[PDB]
Design a protein around this nucleic acid. Structure first.
Ligand code: MG
Ligand code: ZN
Ligand code: ZN
Lengths: 133, 392, 114, 30, 263, 49, 56, 65, 43, 181, 147
DNA sequence: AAGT
RNA sequence: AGGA
DNA sequence: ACTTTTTCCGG
């Protein structure tokens, strides 16, 4: 019932290694130098190129089955252009206050390296991923 | 024949039309049956007692993980294997419409539509995501192949947590009849009937998905691109000169024999080594030049059918043809065919098949390949007979 | 010789009802309808149109085995809305669509001079 | 030029004339 | 004008080329299926053979006769034999054709679909006339006889659909295509160097707009507009293979709606 | 089309299958086996024409 | 070997085999003709009596 | 052995087109490619039906009773 | 029918293998599998 | 075919010339110059496996006769016209094959045994075995309803009469994965 | 089987509507498995097809003769002249939904032969039947209603 | 192809 | 004599 | 000097 992470990154590289619709993206946080980001994206859907300012939000909410339309009426917690849903699988202690979290969006992998998002990021199946700009 | 405890298994009758005994495809391997006109026997127990023996000791699900090699003796074969790879690539995404059918197709479905990997722009599910419905909860599987980081870059190995795929393309190593396999884990961890269900469950989502995606193989899949064919020709050309160089070196007495070998034995070993090195070099060149869109490569990749050597011979070069190890002997006086001048030890005269099947064979190459082939068929026939008595 | 009769594809058997509606235990407001002596022609067509119904949460169909012409159609609707009805409405829409399709073909056909 | 050298397809004109005289079971008969 | 639109390109005795717009693919395909195997026709289904002195066997000719296309215009006013009350057949449910042939000629005597004579009463309805599309007005060649070779047999043609036997096929090949510039990404073009070069362009490319690469993939995009062509065998006329198909399907859906009301 | 080259016996069509053998009046030398008192032999399968 | 260790038996059937992806792992498709020939001897018991008579 | 009525693959009436094909070849001196196409056989399934037909019937007729 | 009138039986040191001499005189492919393989030659 | 050094006008050349090929086809068009006529004009000879030892054979006449005083990449890689010792030329290399193999399309583009398998299967196929089938009382006979001659054919089939008495039908085939049947 | 040592039995028979069709309205008579070709290395099979495809469209007999100048690249040139994609692939559509297949199918004529082994001549069942006189054991052979 |  |  | 095995299934 709340957001778990928020920051803006700049795209270093884009990788379509044998994949035609998917690209592994490399980015770094504008705010903390401590923060780096590796993520697989459906570039056929929302495409990304080198040097893009992209907002990255995590969030636990907005359980059970899935409903398609009527959503016009519903409160779409998306103000973001591309949204995903996946699971956490590894909590890497990369020394010091530095931590790295591994997210799997049905095969589409993501690695976030930072320090501060302690009481926030959890080993949860309930983890969305919102991206804008 | 019946050289296995698994060559005779107990099954549930299903009365069906049409004159053939129908059988699930995963049970193909234990029996060793193909559907090329193969026939099978069916015996019916008469006691409520002889029935218990069949149902309680020799039923197909009991027979899954074999004592012959402490591994599962049945896996996912052919179509299902091929499709399961194609389905699980990161590149593979399925729209709502189909997802809903694939979900209903799994008979033991929870009735819960999983949350898509991408919820807008447009909800899209991944292969992995929906195949994970076939995989039961409580199933844990980890495997690292060459360069498998916890953030799998090539989508190598396998990572299944609580019966949900995290990363990796599912193929022969996972879903196959392998020691660490998804099947071995399931049989052990969940039960024999739970695993027996899973076989069907996986093939239903897969065959359906493949039915609608389609899968082929044509002459286009044997064509290796023009610059790679230059490279292959010159790959054989240099190994042919390497052979001539050792041929003149041996006619000039300069060649120094290997300890415990004829001067000639020492020469032939080297000739046969260069020609077979080139067969692989030309081969390896092609298997690299074929994109992930090559259907032969796609089959090889899942490990559904075919291997490198099969690519190599069709696309690049057939290679040295042998009889009793020694390349085509001088049946005639000092020559292999009357279309050769005497004392010709050259690749061509002794049976090296420079050409690929795609390009075609020369009458000499054909006849030599023919001698080579014949030896294998006589062996097949002799081996089959010997091997039987050994079993007895 | 073990081959069934061709007409068994479309002709309803001894006491076979075209529709066999049974409720789904696993899911609330869900139902599984077995269509006897029917193929993909109807399945894919019905399922597709049910997907155009906003109040229809789930819709799929399956031809469990090919030797047998019969398909199971599963329907799940928003609470209050009955699935039997969802199928009714969807069926009408199709006939009404095909109704305009026939009309529109005839008008264009008549216009031809060949 | 009724003594020009023979081509590749020309061999079939000899093969044709072979069976024409000989026949496919000649051996059994003769 | 209404819901799904039609725009006929070319028309003839045997072929209708048209474009089906504002339609669901599932609808255009269920329509494709129906035209192949659900429209009723009429063809020979019982051949009582009297004398056969021919080079061909009784059943060889039998099978052949069923393939001969018969007029199935006013087919709708013929009962399906099963539904009729007579033991076997009558004028209400069947057309009876007789065929007599003999090698009078010293040359080879040919036996054509024209050599069929209707012996049953047609009740003044259009049915059972063998379709003769032939220029010399001969129709199908059933047989050939030398001299004393006589062919005597009686045939009963009945209703039936192609689902029961391909002889009741009202249509030949049905051409169906959509999205000639793969803008839907419904196919992945196999290639050696270039997808666009190696794969030939459709003629239907002209009736749709080229992709224009400097535009993102329209995921939102759905498949409508189906460049089709229906071929009549002869039985029912082309237009009717379409119209009758449209109707047949409506009737199937209605039967569901109706059977639903019984419960 | 029927080529002939066969026989008709008690009703049925009979084919005499070509029976391969080694030529007669031929001089052949063979190295007789490692454990043997004879090292080499010159054989002649000689029979009248 | 041929009459004691091995034996020709009754309640046995054989035909061409064909693969079916819609069958379960543990099931075998039996053609009607063969099921109609092969016969299990069931004892008339209060549990079966009713079904049994219907088959009789 | 006698022209198949209707092409196996698609179903186009093909039993009529025979003598006409044998005539577009003999009398009209055309090639097989143009002959099939004059007869309006465009799909290769229809083309192969006539192209690859061996009219054996004619040999059987040479026998007396 | 033709291939049966061009058959060759070899009764009873390694005859089954395709010999160099068989070039032009015997078919390199037409031969049975099993017990007769290479002893049943086709011309 | 006989090859003789004997040629006033150049190199070592095949006794048989374009004039003979035309003289044969004069007799072929009738249905004077027979096969026996080539044998007695000494343009062709009978060689057993013994005499084979002492001779030297050319595969192709044309390719293996005149010498070099660009190359197509698609074709199979062939050797050379190196020899000046050639006593004989091969009529056509496809004559190494017997009845059954001669029905195999492109057997040179096949794996060695796949051809041996076919040269056993074609003896289990159906079709017209003789035109007199109706006048003969054989214990079992199968005749295909509508035989089709093949679209892919050997020049050797012309002599086996395969186009006149087929074994199969040209099926419209798709190598695809469908329902998984 | 084809003339490439590729034996096989029917697994199912589908009507024209369930069958996967070309846009041109063509549908197969036969469907063979991709998995047959790689392990077997029967390339001649695919060449038979590509050649036979042209042969049917051209109306000229296709030369499948062994030792010749017929290249797979040559045949491909002629097929593109006939408008099909050079390597014989064709975009097919799923007969059940109408929706295009993601793959393109190797589609063209291939001379198939019918073999003397037919199921209903092979099928057999026994459940008490004739016995031997000596051994008093089930008689041998399907014909004799053997065990 | 072996072994009393 | 033939299939796997 | 002297014997015995060699995969499984229509006439
Ligand atoms: Mg097999
Ligand atoms: Zn009536
Ligand atoms: Zn056709």
């Amino acid at each position: 019932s709340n957001t778990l992470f928020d920051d803006i990154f700049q795209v270093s590289e884009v990788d379509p290694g044998r994949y035609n619709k998917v690209c592994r993206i490399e980015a770094a946080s504008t705010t903390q130098d401590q923060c780096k980001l590796t993520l697989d994206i459906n570039v056929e859907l929302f495409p990304v190129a080198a040097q893009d300012s992209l907002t990255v939000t995590i969030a636990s909410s907005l359980t059970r089955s899935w409903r398609p339309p009527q959503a016009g009426d519903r409160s779409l917690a998306d103000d973001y252009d591309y949204v995903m849903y996946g699971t956490a699988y590894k909590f890497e202690e990369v020394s010091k206050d530095l931590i790295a979290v591994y997210y799997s969006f049905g095969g589409l992998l993501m690695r976030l390296e930072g320090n501060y998002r302690n009481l926030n990021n959890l080993k949860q199946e309930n983890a969305y991923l919102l991206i804008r700009r | 024949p019946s050289l296995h405890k698994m060559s005779m298994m107990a099954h549930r009758v299903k009365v069906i039309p049409y004159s053939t005994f129908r059988l699930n495809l995963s049970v193909t391997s234990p029996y060793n049956a193909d559907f090329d006109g193969d026939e099978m026997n069916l015996h019916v127990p008469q006691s409520e007692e002889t029935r218990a023996e069949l149902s309680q000791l020799c039923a197909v699900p009991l027979q899954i993980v074999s004592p012959q090699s402490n591994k599962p003796c049945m896996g996912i074969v052919q179509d299902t294997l091929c499709g399961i790879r194609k389905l699980t690539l990161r590149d593979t995404f399925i729209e709502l419409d189909q997802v809903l059918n694939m979900l209903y197709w799994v008979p033991d479905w929870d009735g819960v539509i999983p949350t898509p990997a991408i919820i807008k722009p447009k909800p899209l599910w991944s292969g992995k995501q929906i195949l994970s419905v076939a995989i039961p909860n409580g199933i844990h599987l980890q495997r690292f192949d060459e360069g498998t980081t916890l953030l799998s870059p090539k989508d190598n190995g396998m990572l299944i947590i609580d019966g949900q795929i995290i990363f990796g393309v599912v193929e022969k190593k996972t879903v196959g009849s392998s020691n660490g396999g998804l099947i071995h884990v399931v049989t052990r961890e969940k039960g024999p009937q739970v695993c027996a269900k899973l076989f069907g469950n996986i093939q239903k989502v897969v065959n359906f998905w493949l039915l609608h995606n389609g899968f082929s193989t044509g002459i286009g899949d044997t064509i290796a691109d023009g610059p790679t064919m230059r490279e292959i020709t010159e790959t054989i050309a240099e190994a042919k000169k390497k052979v001539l160089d050792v041929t003149k070196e041996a006619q000039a007495n300069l060649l120094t024999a290997k300890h415990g070998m004829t001067l000639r034995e020492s020469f032939e070993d080297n000739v046969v080594r260069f020609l077979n090195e080139a067969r692989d070099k030309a081969g390896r060149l092609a298997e690299v030049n074929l994109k992930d869109l090559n259907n032969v490569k796609q089959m090889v990749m899942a490990g559904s059918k075919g291997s490198f050597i099969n690519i190599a011979q069709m696309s690049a070069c057939v290679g040295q043809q042998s009889v009793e190890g020694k390349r085509i002997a001088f049946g005639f006086v000092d020559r292999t065919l009357p279309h050769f001048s005497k004392d010709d030890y050259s690749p061509e005269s002794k049976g090296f098949v420079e050409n690929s099947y795609l390009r075609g064979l020369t009458p000499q190459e054909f006849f030599f390949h023919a001698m080579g082939g014949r030896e294998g068929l006589i062996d097949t026939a002799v081996k089959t007979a010997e091997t039987g008595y050994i079993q007895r | 010789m073990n081959a069934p009769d061709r007409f068994e594809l479309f002709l309803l058997g001894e006491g076979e009802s075209k529709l066999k509606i049974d409720p789904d235990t696993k899911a609330p407001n869900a139902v599984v309808i077995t269509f006897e002596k029917e193929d993909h022609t109807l399945g894919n067509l019905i399922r597709a149109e049910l997907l155009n119904d906003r109040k229809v949460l789930f819709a799929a169909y399956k031809v469990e085995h090919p030797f047998f012409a019969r398909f199971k159609l599963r329907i799940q609707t928003t609470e209050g809305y009955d699935p039997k009805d969802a199928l009714k409405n969807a069926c009408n829409s199709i006939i009404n669509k095909l109704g305009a399709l026939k009309t529109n073909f005839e008008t264009e056909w008549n216009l031809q001079t060949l | 030029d009724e003594s020009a050298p023979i081509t590749a397809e020309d061999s079939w004109a000899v093969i044709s004339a072979f069976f024409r005289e000989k026949g496919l079971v000649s051996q059994q008969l003769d | 004008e209404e819901g799904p639109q039609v725009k006929i390109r070319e028309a003839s005795k045997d072929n209708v080329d048209f474009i089906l717009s504002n339609v669901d693919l599932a609808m255009a395909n269920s329509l494709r299926r129906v035209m192949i195997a659900e429209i009723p026709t009429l063809a020979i289904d019982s051949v009582e053979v009297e004398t056969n002195t021919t080079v061909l066997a009784d059943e060889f000719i039998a099978h052949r006769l069923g393939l001969i296309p018969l007029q199935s215009m006013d087919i709708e006013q013929l009962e399906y034999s099963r539904d009729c009350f007579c033991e076997d057949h009558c004028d209400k449910c069947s057309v009876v054709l007789t065929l007599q042939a003999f090698g009078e000629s010293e040359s080879t005597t040919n036996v054509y679909s024209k050599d069929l004579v209707i012996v049953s009463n047609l009740m003044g309805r259009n049915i059972g006339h063998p379709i003769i599309q032939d220029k010399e007005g001969n129709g199908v060649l059933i047989c050939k006889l030398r001299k004393g070779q006589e062919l005597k047999l009686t045939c009963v043609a009945k209703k039936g659909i192609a689902k029961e036997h391909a002889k009741w096929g009202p249509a030949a090949a049905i051409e169906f295509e959509y999205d000639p510039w793969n803008k839907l990404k419904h196919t992945d073009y196999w290639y050696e160097q270039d997808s666009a070069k190696e794969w030939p362009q459709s003629k239907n490319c002209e009736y749709e707009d080229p992709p224009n690469e400097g535009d993102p993939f329209d995921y939102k995009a759905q498949a409508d507009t189906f460049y089709m062509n229906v071929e009549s065998v002869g039985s029912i006329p082309v237009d009717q293979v379409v119209v009758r198909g449209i109707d047949t399907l409506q009737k199937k859906v209605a039967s569901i709606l109706l059977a639903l009301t019984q419960m | 089309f029927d080529m002939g080259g066969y026989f008709i016996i008690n009703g049925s069509e009979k084919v005499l299958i070509a029976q391969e053998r080694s030529a007669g009046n031929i001089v052949q030398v063979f190295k007789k086996a490692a454990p043997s008192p004879i090292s080499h032999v010159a054989e002649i399968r000689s029979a009248l024409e | 070997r041929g009459n004691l260790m091995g034996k020709r038996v009754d309640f046995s059937a054989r035909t061409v085999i064909s693969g079916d992806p819609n069958l379960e792992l543990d099931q075998v498709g039996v053609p009607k003709s063969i099921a109609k020939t092969l016969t299990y001897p069931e004892v008339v018991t209060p549990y079966n009596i009713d079904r049994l008579t219907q088959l009789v | 052995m006698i022209v198949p009525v209707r092409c196996f693959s698609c179903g186009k009436v093909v039993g009529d087109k025979w003598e006409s094909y044998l005539n577009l070849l003999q009398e009209d001196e055309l090639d097989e490619g143009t002959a099939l196409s004059r007869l309006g056989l465009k799909r290769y399934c229809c083309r192969r039906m006539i192209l690859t037909h061996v009219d054996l019937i004619e040999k059987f007729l040479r026998y007396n009773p | 029918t033709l291939s049966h009138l061009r058959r060759t039986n070899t009764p009873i040191a390694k005859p089954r293998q395709l010999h160099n001499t068989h070039w032009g005189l015997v078919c390199p492919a037409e031969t049975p599998e099993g017990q007769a393989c290479g002893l049943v030659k086709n011309l | 075919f006989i090859v003789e050094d004997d040629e006033s006008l150049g190199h070592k050349e095949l006794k048989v010339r374009k004039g003979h090929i035309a003289k044969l086809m004069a007799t072929e068009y009738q249905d004077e110059y027979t096969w026996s006529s080539l044998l007695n004009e000494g343009l062709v000879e009978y060689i057993d496996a013994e005499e084979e030892e002492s001779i030297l054979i050319a595969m192709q006449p044309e390719d293996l006769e005149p010498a070099e005083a660009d190359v197509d990449p698609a074709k199979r890689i062939r050797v050379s016209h190196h020899a000046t010792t050639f006593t004989h030329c091969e009529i056509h290399p496809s004559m190494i094959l017997g009845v059954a193999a001669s029905i195999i399309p492109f057997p040179d583009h096949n794996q060695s045994p796949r051809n041996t398998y076919q040269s056993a299967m074609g003896k289990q196929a159906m079709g017209v075995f003789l035109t007199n089938y109706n006048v003969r009382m054989d214990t079992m006979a199968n005749i295909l309803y509508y035989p089709q001659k093949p679209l892919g054919t050997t020049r050797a089939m012309e002599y086996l009469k395969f186009r006149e008495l087929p074994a199969g039908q040209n099926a419209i085939v798709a190598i695809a994965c469908y329902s998984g049947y | 089987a084809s003339r490439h040592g590729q034996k096989g039995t029917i697994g199912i028979t589908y009507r024209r509507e369930d069958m996967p069709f070309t846009a041109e309205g063509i549908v197969p008579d036969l469907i063979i498995n991709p998995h047959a070709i790689p392990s077997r290395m029967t390339v001649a099979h695919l060449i038979e097809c590509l050649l036979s495809k042209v042969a049917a469209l051209s109306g000229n007999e296709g030369d499948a003769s062994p030792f010749t100048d017929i290249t797979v690249e040559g045949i491909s040139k002629l097929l593109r002249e006939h408008g099909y994609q050079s390597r014989g692939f064709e975009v097919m559509y799923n007969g059940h939904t109408g929706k295009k297949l993601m793959a393109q199918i190797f589609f063209g004529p291939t001379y198939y032969q019918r073999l003397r082994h037919m199921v209903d001549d092979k099928i057999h069942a026994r459940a008490r039947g004739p016995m031997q006189v000596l051994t008093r054991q089930p008689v041998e052979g399907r014909s004799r209603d053997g065990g």
